[PDB]
Symmetry: D3
């Protein structure tokens, strides 16, 4: 079998305030901005895990649970919850860090899939992954099914592409 | 029954070149940037359909099919493929418009879900939707299943949230 | 004579909301931002018409007819209204798309001149242009005079340059 | 008669390097960016002259004389060359400051028209303007004709608006 | 005496790749950008420590030890090394996280001073600070002298301000 | 001895309004943004003095004297106050230009150190510097001590680096 890394090894933090330039609606963060930051921190985690350059292959989901207001401090935590052959599932959690009353509510949750690449751009084999704490193993344990859904979606999506191609 | 709008009514175009500031890897567009633009054009389509302010509730998927290089002209086409009670499924297609050889290859495909909101922020009833051309009815016809998958995912995702809440 | 393209062939749309970062005055779009977007969409239209890389040679005019507020949806429509030897006149129309009451008032109007360039940067011959609908032929019919004014202005402007050169 | 300010009083400088994010073509500044900066420095000059908030009413012209490359230092000099009742003509000169060989070639030239506004947004009377040095009086002396051209263009432009309005 | 927080309580991480838009020189991060990010993460740490809104009162130093290239992953670690009455000294460390060979070289080091503010903008009392690990107590132990230097500099700086005021 | 330039030769101005995107707190400029602009204008002055490419070696200080609000016009004046062998001390003054009541209060004051570099990146000898007006000679006369402080700080800072290196 392959070399294995702990989910803790690639675990990445990012803290960032919401500035007016991140908003669309009055004092409310715009989803596109949030998505760009999610992709940023997730890509960094995939790089650490893969020890390589990575690209986003797909955004499997972003659930926006809560409105995020200007001034809010956001904590992003990305980790690798699943390692395929050349691919990684990164799960990102985004919390609002309210310094005034010390709550850290979950504001969003995202799954993305990254592919590790060579010096010359072909998909590159990534190490395996194992959890240590409880959260890590929750994401680790529930990943096989998400991988499963993704396969079906990749089937349907190919159907759509092929239809558009002939039109 | 409710009032109905044609998918053509809310159909929105966006053309945008990829500039160095949109890239991460050498001369290659960064996924976060692409996601932000997808969300921008999708939100505009949802607004036109809903006749209202909208927020992104979830990013159901983004499939990145092709590398997008600096200089590339991107065409975004967003439309409403499904109307729930207060929600809309927007499908966005992103093509590279190669002016040199007149190909318009599909570079990415995205589904997002928007919720129309009041003047005071409660979810607002949206009109129904019907297709006219063939592409529109392809996305219209395949939407019920995607809605279905989303329900299961919203079930699993709630499980995850509840686990994290107690840790 | 040369090959001819319909003004409809290069006709480009762009939809974009005004975000706080686009403003200067309270909730009011800044003219520089509007000008940058005008140049973006105009350049894309010139590229489609020319089948080539282009540069902005001059901004012949931008008339700001109406204040544009934060949140406003802007529709940009660029088309080629005149084809010289290596140059194109792009006219851009900018409308506020008010989804709430379905008006599409003209917020700005711009004329720019682009030059199509080689792989090696010399000016490149562009195809001719002909209108099809009524708007297209309005811009097509009124272009010869604008071309004319531009010649006089290019005369005066050369005088100014030459004066500054000796000071 | 009204109070008069010297063109030197409102004369504004701006120095700014061209960074990769300002470019479109490889290592070449994008025209939209240049236009945004032109509008920025011109607006500051109009504010100093008017002693008030201003808006851009029109971009009368931007002549792009020279390619501007990444790294280039740009010097913007804005001044008021003409004062109407509530309006100002700002002329902006943009030079490349080559620190290596001490040339300061004219890279672009722009005329814009600003309107000074109240606390409540109505057009506000501006002071008159007089030149002191030779350049100032060149722009001062040649302004009456430019004002003249602008009147004719504002006539034609109104015709265009009215045509589009009925279509 | 006042309430005390561990330096670990307010310790904040930030991971961020260097993108082309962060650079000035070819593929080299621009110092201003680095400074903006330093200020961002430092402000977040001060907020967590203070449990309040903060402003940057001064940048006591930024030592740029190493060139930072495009693509580089930067790790920012901010902590409070000194607590005055209403002020905090935040020390930020910036490391290049080379995922390819697992070195984490120190690329920059910064000290800043923040002031915690009310709901109404007056300086607000902050808790005290104590270290736990070795690094924390190194910064904790060497802070009194830095505070000292700052006093002398604030003396000289006041002299300069007063000179400029009369000119 | 070496060639000498007047402090007036490299003296650079920059005028820039504060836009919403420059703020963090409501209508208040963010310190990081101010620092980025300070570094921009200072780098331009160092380039003019050095006749060369430069990098920021250190930010010796930024004193934020006054809150800077959205809309404020900022005037940056950078000059070289000290020339070492390959290094320059740039002092930047930032004033709020209140066009409404013609005050120009000092909002911030910064010292930075730049190193001039070759075509191949080694430190490059800079010309000497001499003052002409009173302000110039104030900064010129007080520089030797600041240079002095910097030496001590560079001593302490090296100690810190070496401690972190073994941990």
């Amino acid at each position: 079998d392959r070399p294995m890394k702990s989910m803790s090894e690639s675990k990445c933090y990012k803290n960032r305030q919401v500035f007016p330039q991140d908003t669309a609606h009055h004092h409310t963060m715009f989803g596109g901005t949030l998505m760009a930051n999610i992709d940023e921190i997730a890509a960094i985690t995939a790089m650490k895990h893969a020890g390589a350059q990575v690209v986003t292959a797909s955004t499997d989901s972003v659930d926006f649970l809560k409105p995020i207001k200007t001034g809010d401090i956001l904590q992003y935590v990305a980790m690798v919850s699943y390692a395929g052959t050349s691919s990684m599932e990164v799960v990102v959690q985004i919390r609002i860090d309210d310094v005034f009353n010390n709550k850290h509510d979950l504001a969003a949750l995202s799954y993305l899939t990254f592919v590790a690449l060579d010096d010359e751009g072909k998909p590159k084999h990534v190490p395996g992954v194992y959890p240590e704490d409880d959260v890590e193993k929750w994401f680790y344990d529930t990943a096989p099914q998400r991988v499963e859904r993704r396969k079906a979606r990749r089937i349907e999506s190919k159907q759509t592409i092929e239809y558009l191609a002939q039109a």
